[PDB]
């Protein structure tokens, strides 16, 4: 057994999505001064699908950047826009050891000062190393160490789905 | 009318840094490799304190670092240890906006690669600004944007209290 269980199947994760767009405009009170910034390869298609969401009840468009960070390498960085004053949204595809979030976060300080900066994220393993939190979470996955996440995104994995594997 | 309530005194402080004690060994597991860092002034005479108490539980001592940052200023800053590879517990008296830990964890990243970082703070009175956490928390005090929280040490202030204010 290396493939374990599926954690999450594309319907559950859609509702996840929502429920993720919702939280987050309730949050910010609005759609005023909000920014997602998709990190993570992943993050990018899931920042974009929550954008396309917040559209769809909010009305208004929400700006998506991109900060494509990984551990520390980059493959292309985009942020059209002034980061600061507003209210960022980092999203996620899974949230581990906060390593990940916090080097991303670091970027964009660097970069501007934001009003305020969320996590958000489609999965959350848990195992912290780092006193990050991710503000809104897709679901809770209790995993063990050796375990493994994998998210599948139709944008690039050409299906939707969250597997559990082990070795 | 800026004095509102008084949110701990001394005997409920003192348990409550005992209870971060036990809650910070039983997370390292130990006293292997551990040790703390005080930041935001009164921060310092916690760690202290919390290193007391460990000790007296433990045996072993546990050192206490000092990185006195304050929003971006420091105005001592002492770690007569390696932070490579040890479980570093940072001690906070207040967590705010979250902006302060953030400061702090960001220093203690360019001076060296803890195991793991831990945040712990006597009070977290809410409205972070950043996806920070504390991992140990004395009380969590819900306040309101105008309200501020003074906490008060005999080491600095004479007295061991901590007082809700407002404007
Ligand atoms: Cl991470
Ligand atoms: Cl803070």
Redesign the interface.
Known sequence: MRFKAELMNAPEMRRALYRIAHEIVEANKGTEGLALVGIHTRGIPLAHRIARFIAEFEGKEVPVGVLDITLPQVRETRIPFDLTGKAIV?VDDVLYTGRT??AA??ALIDLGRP?????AVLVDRGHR???????FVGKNVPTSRSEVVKVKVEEVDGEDRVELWER
């Open positions: 980092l979030a916090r976060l670091d009003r305020r900066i969320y996590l190393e780092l006193p990050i939190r991710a503000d």
